[PDB]
Design a protein around this ligand. Sequence first.
Ligand SMILES: [Ca+2]
Length: 223
Amino acid sequence: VVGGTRAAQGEFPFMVRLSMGCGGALYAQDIVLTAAHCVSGSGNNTSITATGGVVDLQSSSAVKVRSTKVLQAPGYNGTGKDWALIKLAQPINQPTLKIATTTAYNQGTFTVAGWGANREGGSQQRYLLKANVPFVSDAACRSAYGNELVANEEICAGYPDTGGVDPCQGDSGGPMFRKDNADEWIQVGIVSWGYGCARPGYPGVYTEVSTFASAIASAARTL
Ligand SMILES: [Ca+2]
């Protein structure tokens, strides 16, 4: 995360770090919701590691669990539908993150977090970083990305005029969230892509969770 600050231990306990350099959220204690582009496809897979329970990846308190299977959004090909679920061999005993099923929260100021780079071309982070990024309308986002932006499948956030705060390489798959009307965090997005990181005129793009919530929920029941 470019322009982020250190998250406190226990602040966002649903966060998990994935071995390929992605973030993810605990949709269930043993099911990670991440980006489709973080995996190569669906199927049995025991080569992925999810590190949960800590902001400091070097902590002896970290829990490292291996995957058993991956379910990448059906039909994924790099043009939207950027979501995937990863079944874990053992559950990570931490709070889970509720996903948005309506579009009522696709507005306001969001929060993102990850161990990705804090500068373009930078190395990964040892400590979880968090940042607040305001919602950016489809129109403004489209003024930047044109046809690359998939209407209804992608939501944008950040500072369109001046940049400065934005997820970066290594943060993909992480959840973008905010408070619902019950003072509980709810997930409206999944870090997906952007041109560069934190650049004026180029906001961050995220998987619009509300659009795929029913699909994610059904797929998760099959894991
Ligand atoms: Ca949208």
